[PDB]
């Protein structure tokens, strides 16, 4: 929703390959 | 070209109560009026006369009614009299001292 | 050190919302809405403002008298007073030229 | 509204929404046999119309206001 | 809001069959550089404008008051 709770796009965080 | 103006102060009201002296107040104006700089230049410019109940000031030099009130207010503060004596004007250039 | 506000409902600085600061007899500063200034009438062909005519708003020209909107000379409130004198030389000379050209045409078929 | 009667010489009435200033001036002029100087009207926030009827100097508002009956 | 300078034209305005109220105003003014004088202002209320006439001489001030018609209501000061 907001600027927090980030899970999807990522530079080196989760949801990679 | 330099016609003089006469300033009269009514001193009858405070002297009936005994708290004011006209002779002592008249001498205070002699050694405190500044003409052309410092004090002591009353060269036929300012004269102060009194008859025991009213003080008359006749000046031909630069002497306004605000300077007379300014000097009178300093005299009352020296004698601790700025809490029963006011310097009001009944009309133009004619002042009085209200005791109440 | 006294600020003033608008006197009407329009809050924008448009061309019809000019403000002049006026000191009132009450001793306070107060805004006064002024009208848009009138433009002097112009001549029909030279573009210069002809003299002798008052400069008013068009609909208040119907309230002023006759002498403020015209000049006693012909073509008074329309021309530049040198525009009139220019079309008199042209009106007199051309009609004088048009009749001396008619007798030159008469010279042709009468002698060929 | 009653404060305006004694000093302003102005009568306050409730007026139907369809009436204009000509009809208020005409109706007051003959229902109370008075002369009307000017009529001022407004629409109250409850949906009714309130009119300020001012009488001329020949008549007074106070001695006519109690003639209807209200005071 | 109009000023009248002629005293003969002023008397014609008082008999215009519509003016009902006239006012006389006494103004305490002073001359060029010396003594104060008594300035008077005779104002006549018409139907579209207020005509006024100012006289700086006290000799002619009293003379004009008796010349006014008595049907005109004069309001002193």
């Amino acid at each position: 929703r907001g600027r927090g709770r980030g899970r999807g796009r990522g530079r080196g965080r989760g949801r990679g390959r | 070209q330099k016609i003089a103006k006469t300033f009269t102060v009514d001193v009858s009201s405070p002297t009936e109560n005994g708290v004011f002296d006209p002779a002592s107040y008249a001498k205070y104006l002699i050694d405190h009026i500044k003409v052309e700089g410092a004090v002591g230049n009353l060269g036929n410019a300012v004269t102060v006369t009194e008859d025991g109940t009213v003080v008359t000031v006749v000046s031909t030099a630069k002497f306004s009614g605000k300077y007379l009130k300014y000097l009178t207010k300093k005299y009352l503060k020296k004698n601790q009299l700025r809490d029963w004596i006011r310097f009001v004007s009944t009309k133009t250039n004619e002042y009085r001292l209200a005791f109440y | 050190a006294q600020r003033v506000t608008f006197r009407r409902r329009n809050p924008y600085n448009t061309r019809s919302n000019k403000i002049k600061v006026v000191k009132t007899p009450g001793g306070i500063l107060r805004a006064q809405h002024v009208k848009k200034l009138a433009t002097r009438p112009k001549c029909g062909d030279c573009g210069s403002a002809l003299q002798g005519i008052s400069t008013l708003r068009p609909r208040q020209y119907a309230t002023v008298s006759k002498t403020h909107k015209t000049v006693s000379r012909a073509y008074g409130g329309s021309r530049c007073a040198n525009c009139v004198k220019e079309r008199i030389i042209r009106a007199f000379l051309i009609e004088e030229q048009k009749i001396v050209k008619k007798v030159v045409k008469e010279q042709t078929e009468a002698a060929k | 509204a009653m404060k305006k009667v004694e000093d302003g010489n102005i009568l306050v009435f409730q007026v139907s929404m369809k009436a204009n200033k000509y009809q208020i001036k005409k109706a007051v002029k003959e229902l109370y046999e008075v002369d009307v100087l000017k009529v001022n009207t407004l629409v109250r926030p409850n949906g009714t119309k309130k009119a300020y009827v001012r009488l001329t100097a020949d008549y007074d508002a106070l001695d006519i206001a109690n003639r209807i009956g209200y005071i | 809001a109009r000023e009248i300078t002629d005293i003969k034209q002023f008397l014609e305005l008082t008999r215009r069959a519509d003016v009902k109220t006239a006012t006389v105003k006494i103004n305490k003014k002073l001359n060029k550089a010396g003594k104060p004088f008594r300035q008077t202002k005779f104002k006549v209320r018409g139907s579209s404008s207020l005509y006024t006439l100012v006289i700086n001489d006290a000799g002619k001030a009293k003379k004009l008051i008796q010349s006014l018609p008595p049907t005109l209501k004069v309001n002193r000061l």
């Binding site: - | - | 409902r9 | 629409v43 926030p45 409850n46 949906g47 | -």
Partner: protein, 50 residues
């Protein structure tokens, strides 16, 4: 606002008269089930949307 048409002001007058609690004497009637005004409107909680 403050420069509005008559149709907007006519609807504002009806909402002012409807802003009233339930009268006290209705609750004493026979077979009465109304206990409070359920259609009460306030400018701070619900906008009337003109």
């Amino acid at each position: 606002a403050a420069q509005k048409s008559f149709r907007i002001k006519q609807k504002m007058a009806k909402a002012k008269k409807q802003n009233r609690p339930l009268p006290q004497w209705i609750r004493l009637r026979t077979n009465n089930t109304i206990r409070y005004n359920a259609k009460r409107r306030n400018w701070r909680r619900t906008k009337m949307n003109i």
